[PDB]
Amino acid sequence: NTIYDFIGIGIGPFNLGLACLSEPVEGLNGVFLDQNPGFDWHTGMMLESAHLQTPFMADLVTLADPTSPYSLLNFMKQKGKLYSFYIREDFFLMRKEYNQYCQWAAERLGNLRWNTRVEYVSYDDNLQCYRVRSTDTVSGKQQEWLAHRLVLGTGPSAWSPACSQPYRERFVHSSEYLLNKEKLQKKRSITVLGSGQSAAEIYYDLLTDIDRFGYQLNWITRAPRFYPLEYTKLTLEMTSPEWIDYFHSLPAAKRDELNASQKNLYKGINSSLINAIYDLLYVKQLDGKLDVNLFTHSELTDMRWLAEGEFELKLHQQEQDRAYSRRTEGLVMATGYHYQPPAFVEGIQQRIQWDEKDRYDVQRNYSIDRHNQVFVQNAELHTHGFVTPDLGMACYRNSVLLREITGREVYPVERQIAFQTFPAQSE
Template identity: 45%
Template sequence: MEHKQIYTVIGVGIGPFNLGLAALLEPVESITSLFLDQADGFDWHPGLMLDNATLQVPFMADLVTMADPASKYSFLNFLKETDRLYKFYIREDFYILRKEYNLYCQWASNKLPNCSFGKKVESIRYNEAEELYTIEVLDLKNNDVKRYYSEKIVLGTGTQPSLPAFMKDKNLPNVIHTSEYLHRKQDILNAGSVSIIGSGQSAAEIFQDLLPETKENLSMSWFTRPDRFFPMEYSKLTLELTSPEYVDHFYNMPSSQRQTLLGKQPPLYKGINFDLINDIFDTLYEMSVGNVPLNVQLRPSSQLDAVSPEGNSYVLNFTHVQDDLTFTHISDYIILATGYKYKEPQFLKGIESLIQRTEEGLFEVSRRYTIDVAESIFVQNAELHTHGFVTPDLGMGAYRNAIIINSIAGKEIYAVEKRIAFQQFTTQYDNRPKNIHS
């Protein structure tokens, strides 16, 4: 008879959020956990691992600190163990280099006994009689199939590169997503021209990275649909919108109101770092001294409608949003900085009957990040439509994980802040004078 090792929770996918959950669960003896990922090891956006790129959140937004500052899996402890703590101290910069954050996550994943890579989840089924999930997993190293059993699951498969609708079913070799950039950079440099499409941080980082190359033979154009290359809003009172009480406020809105509000909030999470915008301008200014002509175009208000091959190049069809006129552009290479979207994994078909959905077919995510009546299926970074723009924010990862852990445990394992903002986002607060002696 098969011996069943039953885990309290199994996580599928080991990105930063589930890795943080694994780290926070590791010292919790009452909860047994296992995290599975089909990749060989942790590697966060390797195609955009530019040398000088930083996270857009302070170093305290690591895997654990905002839930457990004393955790041995903190970024500061990583620096201490790798003999870089004083270097980081002297650097006097809250913002971690992206490549160092990646090394930190690799360090943590290698230390955590509950993280297992090279394991592809093929299917998940639920046994109602036993109240257990059966997860069928393919070991990519030896092609063995193994079954794991768990009381609860956490979906952390993350987001996938998103391409425009007109790219569906098209095979255009030199039209790539930003996630492929560094893997294809040498090919881009060998091309005569490149166009970047998008208005976010990734587009700006690639534009800045390629700018020096335009002094030689590379011609570069940057197109964006908004009317400007706008900065991410990062003022301190605006940052209070990443607070637990704002999440509560957003969650309790009607669905239609949430969607309307999200449509107005791109500058809060989709813009460009303010300093990077200034660096780009300064670089352009320096390159143009003496009125030297630049092999560069910046074209706001330009909506890309279609791409078609023409010889060894591509024709890009645009609509100028403000002029309401169409125009074309020819480029040898195209980089689509069109972001990422959540894509439901195929293995969910086996438990589809358990999943609650909105009228639009999206996950009906509870305030505690579950998507089923029994509150046994948790999601990470799949609740933008219910919890707001903080969903992909690394800084709120430990907060969400604390809620998930407390929910799994049925008691408080990690203290969770309820109010941290100076602002009041709802009318539901009691503003009557308090008796300080009561």
């Protein structure tokens, strides 16, 4: 019967944000569909010690509306622990607590529909809207949802280098780490492959028990250094509306060349952790020479499993321009995630703007179609820059989505916060 103003497909932290922000808006009928039974965010990398890299004000709502009851501070109050959080005096939430908070919010909301796997989406020429075919996971029932606008907040999927595909059975991706940790620690050697925060957290986790179990503990990365995530406040001003307006110079190549070489700004390791790793190598080394190796500049060219019972990683050191091999029993592939458009998007291919490399040619308002109806959350890294996976700019993006969806500026979008001037400007 009744057409929705928008349907959100996927309830990651971004669409969960949109949901908290959209619920109290007058005359906005929106619904969110997810296939899982509840919210559960990236639980394979929930080590006890792990925090977010982002202060708590980058919760679901506060940067758009601090008065929202879905705030992290309000959560803390309802759980009856806000004074403890006050005494803690720490800007950075534990991942476990953020996950608990997101679950509390998802439970409180009314506009979420869990256990709803979207199977196909199509544009109905006769009704002039989008038709979303779902399947209820608990009952099997088929249902169709009508909507003027879609907002695609699907997650990305685990990614390993192309040459590793034949050994998926042996190595463990970061996402499978916690489950296979006990099995890894029984091995003679472990190698973490990858540059980011996940790799570092894992490396630190294993380094903790290097004296307790046998293992050699290696870390190989393509990155030129173990670079920290750049957190100096003048650079943080680049994660801003003003910079994003600037960044829409509109020259795509520049954008793509900028995104390689701005990796300090989004793909870095938390500075504290790099230093904690050095300090732990130092402390462990007091009992004897440690059996560790750490390489940089190193691309994985090929790999192979030997009868011996070991991997042989062929590596290319790009700076030196010289190839070399390394061996390991255990292999943790902390190579992160890649977004690729979900199966259901096949049904609206001709309605989507694609760029030269067959990804979404995303517009400034986060839209993927030719009429401001199909929007995307995350997966605009190539055209909106390093700011896209940031929870800190979730409220910004959600606020402009709500502006497009509803016509009005529902949440005011702060477009002059920064001391710098980014574009050229004469006097």
